[PDB]
Write a protein that binds this ligand. Structure first.
Ligand SMILES: *Cc1cc2c(cc1C)nc1c(=O)[nH]c(=O)nc-1n2C[C@H](O)[C@H](O)[C@H](O)COP(=O)(O)OP(=O)(O)OC[C@H]1O[C@@H](n2cnc3c(N)ncnc32)[C@H](O)[C@@H]1O
Ligand SMILES: NC(=O)c1ccccc1NC(=O)Nc1cc(Cl)cc(Cl)c1
Length: 456
């Protein structure tokens, strides 16, 4: 049912990603119509003499060629009939079956228009594929409470590296299910994901507050993510970002309170009660009220403004770290004040804590060995048409990694950009590496899938 393409625009797109550095060209791009077509192509790679590389491409948002299949085939998973949300009395809630290539923005619009339902856990950017985020984790300000998107999926259909279509969940083929979740595309291509849904809020009370004291900023973020664990008043989203003085450093706390027709009468009091317990700088509270879809789509709005200034399609040497909360204080003087002290085209530096117990330890996701850890995301872009800007940002990234290494911070890379075998063994640790290698031997022995990750 599917078709191979050698269109130069298709080859060019499959040869690049949002990072703008890795450029390994495939021989062709495969456009599937259904799961059987993907099984057909992977099965042919497995049976073939050479065993050509096959990688699925979501929206191409990888930073360092993770979706590239050098001299092989890139499966363009982008999109046909769609399954309606379903209620289950056994699960005690709703779910929706989605194609692996579906973008979260399209999932949201579908579930809202069919019962006013929505996924509970997001990414900051919705123009990402379901299969792509589920192969990593999928985090945003809801992860402290609902866990990442890999903690909000009931079942998958996976095309293994042998071209076999397998339905898997916690009860059926769990090794493949938990292996695939956070599995960096190593054990198969997700063709269907069964996403957990909740009754969507209608609106969002979106708040930002400034801090000059890092100890107060982190203590407040850590206090906020411990709320609702006892079932009470809490925010529905907890993020943060590092701000430069002009326009020495400030920390911005970013929170939301979700509401609908029922809770609209208690939203102002819930917000004031939660904010009264915090230590932000007086007079630095910025508030906005907008529809839920608009809050969730906030980064796409920033993107359209950047595309207008020719500032979107530039190199993105983005670095994402998970930092144990016990070492976050040291992280600030050495990195935010140290390494970054004194930038390129600019970009956010995100910072917020998450609860490890919301992450299933059976999945392939690698988190620090601590109950509370932070995402620290260095999302700086290089200047357009200025290669030296990319070089300076890459040296800053290596300085951050050397700082963590030299002070023994047990940080773990999110969307790991490792390429050496000893870096991967170190990343996973002995037990996880052993589980990872064994899963690879079982589901992708010829190392056909997602070879751009550079693990096998
Ligand atoms: C560009 C970007 C990325 C991003 C983000 C904002 C922007 C502007 N915000 C994020 C956020 O708030 N939280 C988060 O967790 N991630 C965020 N990201 C990063 C994003 O998750 C990753 O880039 C991820 O790779 C998903 O992006 P995409 O859908 O474009 O996928 P890809 O880059 O093409 O592929 C990634 C890897 O997975 C394999 N792959 C792709 N599709 C599948 C399927 N269906 N099944 C199995 N494996 C799959 C690729 O081969 C590659 O290895
Ligand atoms: N305010 C933002 O979150 C933002 C603004 C402009 C461009 C990107 C944005 N956010 C973003 O890219 N978040 C993201 C990006 C990655 Cl690669 C990984 C993770 Cl955990 C988070």
């Amino acid at each position: 049912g599917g078709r191979l393409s050698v269109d130069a625009s298709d080859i060019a797109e499959a040869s690049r990603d949002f990072g703008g550095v890795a450029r390994a060209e495939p021989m062709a791009v495969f456009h599937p119509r259904a799961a059987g077509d993907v099984a057909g192509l992977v099965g042919a790679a497995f049976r073939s003499a050479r065993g050509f590389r096959v990688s699925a491409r979501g929206h191409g948002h990888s930073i360092s060629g993770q979706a590239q299949a050098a001299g092989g085939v890139v499966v363009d998973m982008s999109r046909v009939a769609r399954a309606l949300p379903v209620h289950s009395a056994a699960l005690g809630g709703h779910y929706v079956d989605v194609w692996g290539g579906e973008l979260w923005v399209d999932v949201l619009n579908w579930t809202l228009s069919h019962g006013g339902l929505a996924p509970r856990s997001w990414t900051d950017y919705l123009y990402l594929s379901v299969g792509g985020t589920l192969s990593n984790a999928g985090i945003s300000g809801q992860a402290f409470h609902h866990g990442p998107q890999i903690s909000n999926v009931y079942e998958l259909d996976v095309v293994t590296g042998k071209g076999e279509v397998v339905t898997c969940s916690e009860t059926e083929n769990p090794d493949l299910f938990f292996g695939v979740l956070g599995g960096l595309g190593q054990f198969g291509i997700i063709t269907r994901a069964r996403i957990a849904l909740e009754r969507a809020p209608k609106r969002v009370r979106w708040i930002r507050a400034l801090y000059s004291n890092f100890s107060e900023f982190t203590a407040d973020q850590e206090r906020l993510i411990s709320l609702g664990s006892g079932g009470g008043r809490r925010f529905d989203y907890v993020e943060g970002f590092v701000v430069a003085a002009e326009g020495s450093v400030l920390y911005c706390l970013e929170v939301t309170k979700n509401y609908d027709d029922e809770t609209a009468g208690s939203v102002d009091q819930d917000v004031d009660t939660l904010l009264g317990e915090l230590n932000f700088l007086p007079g630095t509270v910025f508030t906005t009220d907008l529809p839920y879809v608009d809050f969730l789509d906030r980064v796409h709005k920033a993107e359209l403004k950047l595309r207008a200034k020719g500032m979107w399609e530039v190199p993105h040497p983005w670095l994402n770290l998970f930092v144990p909360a016990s070492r976050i204080a040291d992280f600030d003087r050495g990195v935010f004040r140290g390494v970054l002290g004194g930038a390129g085209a600019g970009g956010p530096v995100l910072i917020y804590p998450m609860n490890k117990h919301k992450w299933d330890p059976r999945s392939s996701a690698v988190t620090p060995d601590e109950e509370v850890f932070y995402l620290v995301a260095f999302l700086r872009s290089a200047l357009p048409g200025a290669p030296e800007s990319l070089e300076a940002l890459a040296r800053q990234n290596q300085r951050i990694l050397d700082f963590c290494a030299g002070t023994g911070i047990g940080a773990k890379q999110y969307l790991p950009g490792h390429k050496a075998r000893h870096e991967w063994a170190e990343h996973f640790g002995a037990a996880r590496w052993d589980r990872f290698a064994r899963l690879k031997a079982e589901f992708d022995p010829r190392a056909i899938l997602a070879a751009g990750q550079g693990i096998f």
